[PDB]
Design a protein around this ligand. Sequence first.
Ligand code: CL
Lengths: 146, 153
Amino acid sequence: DLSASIDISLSQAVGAEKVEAIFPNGKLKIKLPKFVEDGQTIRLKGQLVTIRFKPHSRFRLEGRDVHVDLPVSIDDAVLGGKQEVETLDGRISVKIPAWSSSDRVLRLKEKGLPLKAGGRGDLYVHVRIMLPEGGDKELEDFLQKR
Amino acid sequence: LSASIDISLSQAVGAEKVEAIFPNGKHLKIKLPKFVEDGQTIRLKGQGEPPGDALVTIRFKPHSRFRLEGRDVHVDLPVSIDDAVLGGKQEVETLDGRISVKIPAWSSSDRVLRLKEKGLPLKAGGRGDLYVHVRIMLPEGGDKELEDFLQKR
Ligand SMILES: [Cl-]
C-alpha cells in the first residue's frame, strides 16, 4: 500500500471536486467525500490518504459552521448597502441592514461545511465598522464640532 | 463525601471564601487558592465521615461577555463612532469591576487594547491580561446629525 497527506482549502471540502495526492513512492486525483473532516483518513480501493484543512485567516471554524468578518464603511453601516464578501463557495453580495452595529451578525443558511447527517452548516458574517485608513477629515471635522 | 461549587470569574480572581454544601447537609467554608482552575478539586482531609475525605470541585460559571484564553480574558467594548475617531474614555465592566479605559484616536473595530494584570491569577504568581476588542456601535435611537452627514456623501 501507500500512505500520503494532502492539504485542501475549506472551499475544496465543500465543493468535493477532485484534488491531487502525492505519495512517497511518487504515484492520484481523488474526488473528496461530501463530508470531509480535518484529520480524516480515506482508504482508496485499488491502492491511505489523510485530509488536512489549509489555513484560512478570513474563516474561523466552529464545528461545521463558518464565520467571516466583513469590514464596512461607517456610511454603509448607518444607511445600509450591498457589499461583496468572499466565501467558500465564491464571491457573493450581501445586504447590510440599516443601523447595523459591529455586533450585527448575518446568517446565510447551508453555506457552511457539509454535515455528516446531511445538508450543510451556516455561514455567519460579522459586521465590523472600520475606518478607511488615511483619514476622512470630513467625518473628523464633523465629530469635533459635536 | 463529594460536593461541587460554582463561582464567577470575579470570584476566581478574589480567592475569597466560598461555601460548599454536601448531600448530607454538612456545610463548609473554604478559602480558594489564588490560582483556581475549572474542574479543580480540593481535598479536605477528615472532613468526610464516609474516617473519610471531603472533595469539593470548583467549576467556573459561563460568562458570555468574557471569553477565556488560558488565563488571559477577552471582552468586547462598545464604542461610539465619535469616541473611535477622536479618542475618549469609555467604561468597561471587568472582573475587578467597572473600569474606565482610554480609547486611542482613530481606533477601528479590529483594534485590541491590552490591560495588564486584569486577567485571572497565574500559577507562577501575578495575573494575566485583559484584551479589549473595540467595536464601533450606533445609538439605539439614532443621531440624525451623523445620519444627515453620511447620506450627503
Ligand atoms: Cl510584558
